[PDB]
Each structure stands twice: as C-alpha cells, then as structure tokens.
Amino acid sequence: MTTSTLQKAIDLVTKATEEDKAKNYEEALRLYQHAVEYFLHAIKYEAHSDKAKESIRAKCVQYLDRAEKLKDYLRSK
C-alpha cells in the first residue's frame, strides 16, 4: 500500500537481478547502486536493534560488491 525506504531497496535489487539476465548490465548498475543508497539511509535515519542493523549492513555491503562487478563487466565489453 505505502512505499517505504526499506521497501524500495528490496524492489531495487529485484529489478537489477532480473535485468542482469536480460543483458541489461548497464541498468543493473544503476538499480543495484540505488538500492544500496536506500539501505544505508534506512540505517542512519531508521536505526533498529543490532539484529536489523547488522542484517541491513550486510545486505548493502553485499550488493555494493556485486554492483562493482557489473560495471567492470560492461566497461570491459
């Protein structure tokens, strides 16, 4: 019903993963990168328990590493 900061991060990563398979490495770079921005912002403003903080921190860091590989892939090609 209502779109939140954390909800947008989950959809941003889903659109990137699907795009990557559709030869949309370029789009995936912007999608994955955008998701990481919403994740970090969610932690800074909306700070939850250690469980949530660590969960989100681990998600953003994991996505950041993937988005970096997509750039080198499209850049090289």
Helices (H), 1-76: 5-21, 25-45, 50-76
Determination technique for this entry: NMR
The first and second tokens of residue 7, run together, are 């909800």
Ordered by where they begin, the domains of the chain are 4-77 (1.20.58.80)
DSSP 77: -
Q: Which residues contact 41 (CB under 8 A, 6 or more apart)?
A: 5
Residue type, 21: K
**Torsion angle (degrees, nearest 10) of CA 16, 21, 23, 29:** 20
Residue pair 24/55 in contact by the 8 Å Cβ criterion: no
